[PDB]
Each structure stands twice: as structure tokens, then as C-alpha cells.
Amino acid sequence: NTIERFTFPHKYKDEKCTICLSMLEDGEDVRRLPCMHLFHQLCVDQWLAMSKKCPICRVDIE
Template sequence: MSFLSTHESCPICLEAFKDGSFVFQLQCGHVFHQQCVEEWLKNVKSCQICRSQL
């Protein structure tokens, strides 16, 4: 089973991960598009899913 088949979409933008997508996994294990999570973390210093502090 591939990484992209276990993580179907970005929780921030809700778009599907595609082959070649740049993704980022936080310390808590949640995965996002790299660009989405970079923008998110400029304003909020916690995971969008579990609110774990970063």
C-alpha cells in the first residue's frame, strides 16, 4: 500500500493528493500539502486536525 493510498486528501484544502504532490507530515503524523501547511503554520502553531502544539 502506498503513502498516497493511505492519505487520500489534504485536510486543509480538501484536494486529493496526487502522484508528484509535495506533502509534509507533522510530528503528530498528520499529512498535508506542503504549501497548505506552510500557510497554516504562519498563523497557527498547532496541527489543524489534533491541535497538537508544534
């Protein structure tokens, strides 16, 4: 929605998702925010569409 305009969805190629606490693994659908923080799409996309801010650093993606 608004999410895709301001962030970078892509396939991942040791980093941890801070939402689910699991390691980011090869081929997983992940998303980078303008602040450079990285999350699984599953974990972040619904929350982010509503908050429009990075869970970690609180910076608005817009």
C-alpha cells in the first residue's frame, strides 16, 4: 500500500529479525526501511502499514 512506496521488499541473501527473534535466512521475504533496519515481511508488514514507523528506531518511513 503506502508501505511499498517507502520501503524495500526483497529476498534475503548473521542478522536477526527483532520482531520474531529468528535469524534472517537465505530466500526469506524481508524488507528494508529508509533507516536501513531490516525485518521479515511477515513480521513487520501489517504493523508497519498502521504505524508507518520503524519498530526499532521509531523514525517515520514517510
